[PDB]
Amino acid sequence: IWGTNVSIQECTTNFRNFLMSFKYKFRKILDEREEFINNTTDEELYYIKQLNEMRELGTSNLNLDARNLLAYKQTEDLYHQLLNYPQEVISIMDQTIKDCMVSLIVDNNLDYDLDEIETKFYKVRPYNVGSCKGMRELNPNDIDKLINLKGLVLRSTPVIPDMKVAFFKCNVCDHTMAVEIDRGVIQEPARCERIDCNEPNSMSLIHNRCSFADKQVIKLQETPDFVPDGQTPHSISLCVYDELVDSCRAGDRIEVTGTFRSIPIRANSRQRVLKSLYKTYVDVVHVKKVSITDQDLAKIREVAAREDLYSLLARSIAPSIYELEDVKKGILLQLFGGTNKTFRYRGDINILLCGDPSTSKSQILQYVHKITPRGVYTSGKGSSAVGLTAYITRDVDTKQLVLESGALVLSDGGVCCIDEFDKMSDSTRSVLHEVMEQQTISIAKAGIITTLNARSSILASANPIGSRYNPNLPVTENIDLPPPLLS
Amino acid sequence: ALPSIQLPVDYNNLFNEITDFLVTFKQDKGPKYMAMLQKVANRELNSVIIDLDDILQYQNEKFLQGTQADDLVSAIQQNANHFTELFCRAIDNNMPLPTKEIDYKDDVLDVILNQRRLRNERMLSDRELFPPNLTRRYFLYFKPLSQNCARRYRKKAISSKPLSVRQIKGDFLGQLITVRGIITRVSDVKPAVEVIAYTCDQCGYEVFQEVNSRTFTPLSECTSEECSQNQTKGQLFMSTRASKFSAFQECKIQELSQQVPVGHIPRSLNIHVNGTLVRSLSPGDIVDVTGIFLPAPYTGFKALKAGLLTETYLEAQFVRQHKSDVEERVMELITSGDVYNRLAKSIAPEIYGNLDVKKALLLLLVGGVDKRVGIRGDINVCLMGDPGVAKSQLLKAICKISPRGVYTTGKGTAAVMKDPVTDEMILEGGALVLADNGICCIDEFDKMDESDRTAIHEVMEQQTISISKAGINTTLNARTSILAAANPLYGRYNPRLSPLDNINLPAALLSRFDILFLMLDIPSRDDDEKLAEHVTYVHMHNKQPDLDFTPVEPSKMREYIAYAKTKRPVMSEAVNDYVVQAYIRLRQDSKREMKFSFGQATPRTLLGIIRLSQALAKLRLADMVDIDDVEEALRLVRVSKESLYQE
DNA sequence: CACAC
DNA sequence: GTGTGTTTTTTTTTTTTTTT
Ligand SMILES: Nc1ncnc2c1ncn2[C@@H]1O[C@H](COP(=O)(O)OP(=O)(O)OP(O)(O)=S)[C@@H](O)[C@H]1O
Ligand SMILES: [Mg+2]
Ligand SMILES: [Zn+2]
Ligand SMILES: [Zn+2]
């Protein structure tokens, strides 16, 4: 390796002898894990078993823990160089993966297409590279270094095509040749590759006939529990290539590992004058989301056979809240709901919680929202997180007139937990009227006419007017809700 | 042509005297700066702080024995940029060898050095190569002169005098000056390239290009001797591994309110900090920054559009903030001064009366601790009061004494997104999140819109605010204790009118506050007289009429909270029993009262009582929650409830 | 305007 | 060597207008 005075062959041999002859007992004794008594999960060649699993499943990526290199003896300097020179180390890492797999295929007599193995590109995803470094502590000596970071992503760009292999066609003889592209530079041929033509300046790039890979920049935000309270959490630009695309939706609290790299930014697009800022990013190599079964069916039949299953489920609805037995029973029935009869019949339950202001009115709401798979909790008066109705807005970026969905839609089957149901605006009251009566939301604005199927369940909770609900006074005179919506 | 001028500075003699100063300075181990340079060689330091006082003392010493100086202290205040490079070259010339076994696992620059040295040497025998800045793993800064109090400060030592932004005339360009001011905007840390380290595809050569222009052009042409003689015309590849980068931050410091003449507008100044001085500043900093004042140019095409009218910035060199011994001292205060009574008056010494409100303020400052969930340790009070009562002064005092304490009016928090179009930054703060581990003093809580109503609500049952600019749903933590200072609508409070009818706030939000007090003023014969006496004395002496113990420092409360946060006074079984019968009888008397319906006892009142008892024991050692603690908490709660029913 | 295309 | 190309901006603040 240039710039490090490190031979590639010795590193490849170290990782090769680390692949086999290495057992998870090395990991168990490296961390001084007292539960080293396990033998099958420790003394077995874990990497060999992973190779067997990959061969029988035909996958590409490999999730390697950096601690395993410390566990092995000859791969300590390998770990050091990986921390220092991740690019070349990872390249030879994956090359040795492929070579060891083909060698294992040859040796174990496991018949398989060798060309299939060779053509397939196999990846390594080294995680747990180091301590939980803070992105605020990114001093500029971390360039070209493998870094572990923690944070919650803000947003994700769409799929970005980056051209990997060029495709030039000779416009005077229809000779098509492909040029490998490294570091994003065009090494266009000087003349036609065919000798009978060999015409210079006769090659035009055929954009749709080239080869393209997928780049997806993500916007990572520092996790709240580690950012200083005085200052807002900062943001970084994640880079995703060739895999893990859409593996992280917006809002995911994840631990990322990747190579921290920076590139200059052109001061003027037409010129090559370069600003001295060197916009930074990270080339992600692994992401961990830190956050149906026969045995499950057996559990279902066991709980069904229980005589008190009704009461048991009612208690499990709100274990921390006392009394409210019939409330729990009704909520459970709503989570079950009627059959969605087809031929329209709702086949669903709408429940409202009136009465004097009680904290339990919201506590059981959060409990049921956690319980229900679908649906979303929402404050009808507030609607801060979700607008409670689907409407079209201009996204600012590219100024596109994009439709965003409300809380009612996407909550089909599940329960959309409503709070402050009395205090919500009359416009969303009419929207609720539409969704509860017609079961669909009809929108006609900005040249767009559409009907969206909501088919949601409603569990609302509204506080009354005044200090508290008046039992002598009727429900209508205290909850301040339109009689059609109430009924 | 370029005309020439004669100037008596003598850079050569100055450099030689600089070397003599560095080698032969021993402050009142060996030389201090040789020790620092050896430590740098040990990789134990990469920050050379050149103190002006050391140079001045060296000049004082050698003046008595030969006058072998040219007033370097005054000579470098005229153009410090050249002397920075002079000091760098002097350090490199007198750079000691490492005297420690420093691990060279990451020695990429050393690897490049030895590799290129061997490559050059294998043809040198015929069988500067490196930039001076590239070899440097250190950075050099200047410490300004201290106060002189002598004839040497004969209007000289411009760095000793703290200037303001308006005092920075254009003639000061190139001088090492200092300013006193408050930051307003700090940028993020970014890698600014010092020297690029291009590598050629063939010819194997690596060429370095130093850049100080904020913008450059790539070489991409193998002008190396082998490539040129072979005419291979190789293109150069930029190499971050061998290139040199520096952490950079760009602050925007404004001038203080006192530095602004009447009828004027405060100005601003951009500061470019780099090296190890990055991340040393925050927007909420009032500092005396000393640095080099330089004319940042409009390099490019904009220079032609504008002309000789350039822009300026300060290359900062030094920053001085303005802003268990104390633990033993606060036990001494506890034993001597009765905190419950003495610190109550200490919070508002200039405010006469309402001592129980002051004690409630102490309890809020201490705060309960019930972080375990299955709640919250923030105590919240609302001061509806009465117009004309010094609620605003109490909030101002609380803000000036509570750490991370902020004050704002109901009508001006919230948050904003991408305020500057140019940088397009993300997630600007507000006012509620500023007092994250602090208290927000909300004056005019009544004159506060539904948007901020819901924001402060979400905060108070969540200890966190959230925004949904473009569906991002990002959130900012604000575990702020809520201190409201609304006032009754239509002016004066009406005792006959119901308290919730007197203020345009929802009853649900008001009940969720832990405690509330009616403190309204009533015209008397003596209380007004004594208050007038107090105000007149304050006007006489610019100080309070000290008639009792008046502690000043608020760090006593800091010690109390830090000490008892880990303690977490555990509620006793007797405590739980007494508070449960207290709730039973409170609800019973609330019903038997049913005169205002706001007097109903709620589990929220129980949570408030629990957190008040936690804060009470928190101020008083650990595990003081007992019959006495709950009695004090219930007494305070009942006093607050009867306050609403005053008269 | 002037350096880069 | 003749002739180019940038730097270069739409915020905040008034005023009007329709709903609400
Ligand atoms: N008990 C007191 N001790 C000392 N000064 C007091 C006292 N009560 C009122 N003041 C004075 O009254 C002024 C403060 O009154 P404010 O707090 O502005 O009245 P207010 O009730 O807040 O009205 P606002 O601002 O409309 S809510 C200062 O000049 C104080 O010195
Ligand atoms: Mg006031
Ligand atoms: Zn051809
Ligand atoms: Zn070359």
Residue numbers in B near A399 (CB within 8 A): none
Please give the distance of CA B120 from its chain centroid, rounded to a whole number: 51
Structure token pair of residue B604 = 């929220």
Contact state of A280 with B215 under an 8 Å Cβ cutoff: no
Integer Cα distance of B29 and B10 in angstroms: 32
The strand pairing partners of B183, in sequence order, are B253
No. of helices (H) and no. of strands (E), chain A: 14, 20
Residue carrying the six token digits 């604005």: A445
Q: Which residues of B361-382 are buried (b: 16+ CB within 10 A; e: fewer)?
A: bbbbbbbbbeeeeeebbbbbbb
- Among protein residues, the one whose CA lies closest to atom 5 of ligand 1: B351
Amino acid A347 reads G
- The DSSP line for A113-132 is -HHHHHHS------B--SS-
Nearest nucleotide, CA B303 to C1': D7
Fold for B324-640, please state it.
Rossmann fold (3.40.50)
CA distance B171 to chain A (A): 28
A230 marked as binding residue: no
Helices A76-84 and A86-107, packing angle to 10 deg: 130
Structure token pair of residue B87 = 């000091």
- In sequence order, which residues have a C-beta less than 8 Å from that of residue A130 and are 6 or more positions away? A66, A83, A146, A147, A148
CA distance B377 to chain A (A): 17
Q: Which of residues 211-230 of A touch B (CB under 8 A)?
A: 219, 221, 224, 229-230
CA distance A57 to chain B (A): 37
Integer Cα distance of B299 and A274 in angstroms: 12
| CA angle A167–A173–A179, rounded 5-degree value | 20
Exposure of B618 in the CB half-sphere (CA atoms within 13 A): 29
Amino acid A244 reads L
CA distance A140 to chain B (A): 6
Q: Which of B246, B472, B597 sits opposite A467 (nearest CB)?
A: B597
Nucleotides of C under 7 A from a protein CB: 1-5
CA distances from B344 to A305, A384, B23, B485, B554 (A): 65, 40, 59, 19, 12
| CA angle B606–B611–B612, rounded 5-degree value | 95
B305 touches strand D (CB under 7 A): yes
Q: Dihedral sign, CA of B77, B82, B88, B91? A: negative
Structure token pair of residue B2 = 């370029």
Nucleotides of D under 7 A from a protein CB: 5-12
Q: Which residues of A404-437 are buried (b: 16+ CB within 10 A; e: fewer)?
A: ebbbbbbbbebbbbbbbbbbbeeebbebbeebbe
| CA angle A62–A67–A72, rounded 5-degree value | 95
Contact state of A468 with B600 under an 8 Å Cβ cutoff: yes
| Atom of ligand 1 lying closest to residue B487 CA | 27
Contact between residue B479 and residue B437 where contact means Cβ atoms under 8 Å apart: yes
Contact between residue A457 and residue A415 where contact means Cβ atoms under 8 Å apart: yes
Gap from B297 CA to D3 C1', Å: 28
The strand pairing partners of B314, in sequence order, are B271, B293
Contact state of A278 with B598 under an 8 Å Cβ cutoff: no
Structure token pair of residue A143 = 């360039």
Method by which the model was determined: cryo-EM
Mutate to test the pocket of ligand 1, among B392, B411, B483 (most ligand atoms within 8 A of CB): B392
The strand pairing partners of A254, in sequence order, are A151
- In sequence order, which residues have a C-beta less than 8 Å from that of residue A108 and are 6 or more positions away? none
Integer Cα distance of A254 and A220 in angstroms: 9
Nearest nucleotide, CA B298 to C1': D7
- Among protein residues, the one whose CA lies closest to atom 30 of ligand 1: B390
Contact between residue B496 and residue B396 where contact means Cβ atoms under 8 Å apart: no
B645 marked as binding residue: no
Residue carrying the six token digits 């000393």: B290
Helices (H), B447-518: 450-460, 499-502, 507-512
Integer Cα distance of B404 and A230 in angstroms: 8
Structure token pair of residue A487 = 């009924």
SS (H, E, C) B169-219: CHHHCCCEEEEEEEEEEECCCEEEEEEEEEEECCCCCEEEEECCCCEECCC
What size, in residues, is chain A?
487
- Among protein residues, the one whose CA lies closest to atom 24 of ligand 1: B387
Gyration radius of chain A over CA positions: 30
- In sequence order, which residues have a C-beta less than 8 Å from that of residue A297 and are 6 or more positions away? none
SS (H, E, C) A344-382: CCCCCCEEEECCCCCHHHHHHHHHHHHHCCCCCCEECCC
Contact between residue B554 and residue B573 where contact means Cβ atoms under 8 Å apart: no
Integer Cα distance of A393 and A386 in angstroms: 14
Chain B interface disruption, residue of A188, A272, A467, A478, most B CBs within 10 A: A467
Nearest nucleotide, CA B304 to C1': C1
A467 marked as binding residue: no
Chain A interface disruption, residue of B107, B190, B219, B244, most A CBs within 10 A: B190
Chain B interface disruption, residue of A4, A155, A188, A229, most B CBs within 10 A: A229
Q: Which of A3, A136, A278 sits opposite B111 (nearest CB)?
A: A3
Say whether residue A5 is in contact with chain B using an 8 A CB cutoff.
Answer: yes
CA distances from B620 to A43, B623, B628 (A): 57, 8, 12
A380 marked as binding residue: no
Integer Cα distance of B640 and B636 in angstroms: 6
Residue carrying the six token digits 């998870």: A24
Contact state of B216 with A136 under an 8 Å Cβ cutoff: no
CA distances from B101 to B39, B41, B43, B105, B579 (A): 12, 11, 10, 12, 65
